């Protein structure tokens, strides 16, 4: 129930550009989390604006949308016990400068505007983001052979 918790992770345009797709996935694979959905795509401004709706009334919003629309992205859904929160920990701090060596952001990027990845915030927002980026038909259900060795 708690092991079925899901989160949305997306490789931003700079992550794709600098060749970090394999490395990011591998970090989640290795940890024992389960890949539920994955696709490569060009996000539409219309989708980016929904995704980033909270920054609407914030300065330079259109610059962000434009930037997110400048290259393809890799949206994903990972499942497991406390994946939202743990996922966030693995990514490191949103601002790369406060990210610790060992976290994804700590090892691979420098500035907040080019921080290679996004991971849902909390369960509720993970929920909204998954639904925005994927159809229910794009969410694959399977059972890893190593399951019993990962969970009690």
């Amino acid at each position: 129930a708690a092991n079925k918790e899901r989160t949305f992770i997306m490789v931003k345009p700079d992550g794709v550009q600098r060749g970090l797709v394999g490395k990011i996935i591998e970090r989640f694979e290795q940890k024992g989390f389960k890949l539920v959905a994955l696709k490569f795509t060009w996000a539409s401004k219309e989708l980016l604006e929904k995704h980033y709706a909270d920054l609407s009334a914030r300065p330079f919003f259109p610059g962000l949308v434009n930037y997110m629309n400048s290259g393809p992205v890799v949206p994903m859904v990972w499942e497991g016990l406390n994946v939202v929160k743990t996922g966030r920990q693995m990514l490191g701090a949103t601002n790369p400068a406060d990210s610790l060596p060992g976290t994804i952001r700590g090892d691979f990027c420098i500035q907040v505007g080019r921080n290679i990845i996004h991971g849902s915030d909390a369960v509720e927002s993970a929920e909204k983001e998954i639904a925005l980026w994927f159809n229910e038909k794009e969410l694959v259900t399977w059972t890893p052979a190593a399951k019993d060795w990962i969970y009690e």
Copy 2:
């Protein structure tokens, strides 16, 4: 047009199950190849039979199709100079026993029936395979920043 050649690579169910998705993707990204399309899905027999249509007369046909439908797959398209042939070189011989250390199959698997990845045979089969697995809507066009350091 040479540098725009495309090939179809697919992580088989045993690749998914043994957590090699990122390791595999990483191998293509490091090489200098460009990701054009990617998805995570459970393939129907309908699609598999079509995909494996050439092996219809083979006695292992029905089991192959059954095996390939026992877990999710990760189909993808890579682009770059001579990617069908280079791609085949990177995965190693079809029978893991003949693959050399250094190749994908070579380093991560042992038996022909659990050979973790599928790679297009030739340009002609690549084209058929890509059209079968992806809509034209899902093949992304983008320009890598290092393109000029990869291709003269």
Copy 3:
């Protein structure tokens, strides 16, 4: 000599099952710690009951012993300056969810019950643990060639 302190590190059954032996060993070698003992074994309940004597009164006791007896384990002895304590650091918090990225648990597991490794608590318990798991003849004494580049 503080450089001669020893600690007991054991890879649990989920670690073995998940293929993390080489990787775990590599983390200690990389660091400059010296391997003193190593073996692959299936631990008996009797052996596990002495190892876990202190938890004898706990309601989970019996669950623990059955689990630790459900697969093979890799007991080992590492030597070096502050190895008991530093070793602990390297593994992370007991609860993987509290373990930070870059640590053995942080990077490779999720649930407390399936936390892949065991590291002695302190110097006193490391001594108890080594005696339980190894014979005097099983402790190898050697001098690494890089010794003078590791210690002042």
Copy 4:
């Protein structure tokens, strides 16, 4: 069962001294081979003289035995389909200079005399070698959870 074949792999003293134990072990685990026995030991001349009985008449014989007795070693037993033969492939040619990149010797050593590892020659000698180095009780029998994803 061809999947139950065993081979003897031993990390020589230069491999131990050079810190390649974890990395060597990792190459076999990655591959899908199953660990059956493992230990850290200092081999006696008497033990080395039975291991090398066939070279007894050679002028280098005595040199070899002294060398193999100059540091600790890591004897191990791996199991799986064509492991004797495949294991050999993975190590490379006896002469590292003839060993290709991607192989244990190709990637990690240079001179024949300091070639970091030993792998049985054939099935008959693997059986001889295992009996010399391990006791029946030291061979662990277990079933990896990924077994069905490794073999047909």
Copy 5:
């Protein structure tokens, strides 16, 4: 001008001797930092005393200088936003015992006198250190192709 900040990093003799030169360089390159200068050399005491001038009154001064002159060093200059501070974060605490797993010192060393790398303290000391170790002729100016995916 912020993004053009520079820091001095140096692989100490124990880093050279334990074969960490490429691993270290790799860590800065992956991060997104830009190499400005690099060389392999044996430092004189004359240079070391100058370099360590601030520790002149320290009782360990003469031994430090003696140790630092016992093997070749790999001095280098890296450039990028907040590189002095980030750089210090990546290497970990000066005393390896306090470094966290994930940092350079943390992952590869154990004692303060064999802490494998040197990283500038602050912008002011970076400037002095760079001027001491390199001529203006040896600092290279170049523009990385991914600059725009690193810096906004």
Copy 6:
């Protein structure tokens, strides 16, 4: 004498640009070869023309010189038994298409005009190239602590 053989390896502008400096060095470190000289620089056309003198009368010579002068390079000198030839093997085929997975060129590049690295040809030319790129004062002499474990 034969263990003192030396070779010239240079990371080309595309190797620097795509972040392969650390990875390339690490491959040589790990193998047991010894780093003798290293520097980061911008090669002058005057130096490139001397280096490439053999292609003088060949078509598009000026394009090559121009290309080599378009970014900084990393000239190096590695020492060891059969380093010229072995070094060449590690690099893989000059044309990336014929390079095997596991070689430097096999894992990281695609086209002959953007093949990231250069390695002397033969002893005699290694000799001429070292002298062209480095002063005798830039060649550091030292002795690795692991030496006896590398060479008989």
